[PDB]
Curated annotation (Swiss-Prot):
Gene: MB
Keyword DNA-binding annotated: no
Organism: Sus scrofa (Pig)
Protein residues bound to heme b: H93
Any Gene Ontology biological process: oxygen transport
Top EC class, one word: oxidoreductase
Protein name per the record: Myoglobin
Amino acid sequence: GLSDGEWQLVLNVWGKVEADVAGHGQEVLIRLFKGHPETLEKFDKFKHLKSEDEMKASEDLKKHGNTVLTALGGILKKKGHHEAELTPLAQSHATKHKIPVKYLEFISEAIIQVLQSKHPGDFGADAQGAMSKALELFRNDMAAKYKELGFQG
Ligand code: HEM
């Protein structure tokens, strides 16, 4: 997994995110969308946004983003022991939202791109690998539940 040190780099870069969840959330969504338009399609709720400007205006985009990052935040802090937490999430996304794991991959990227854009100073070579490792662990586990739930294999 992640060493204890790796988990500390992660918990650390994450306390930056917690001083502003809604704004970090909002920018990760914008980037994912601007970046994988198709992922945009998954949200009824947001298909109708046609420009960055539009995404940036959306109260509800900003709120969905808080929610996404509040939920990851809660997983991250279990530092690995996030079975109880990952479950509801893999259930909902596998079966209701129908999110492919590739998408999880896109978001991970979106998330890392925001931390680099915003915390270049706190998000060095080490914070970088800590973080991406924590996120592949998360995808990998998501992935696992899918397989079992009997999904995208
Ligand atoms: C770090 C990755 C993610 C986290 C922590 C996350 C978290 C959440 C949470 C907490 C909810 C609300 C509760 C629930 O339905 O279980 C939700 C809903 C949803 N998620 Fe995600 N999600 C992630 C990635 C994605 C991705 C990549 C997509 C698809 C592009 C996605 C699509 C959706 C949709 C369509 C909804 C329903 C929102 C609505 O329309 O009310 N999520 N997600």
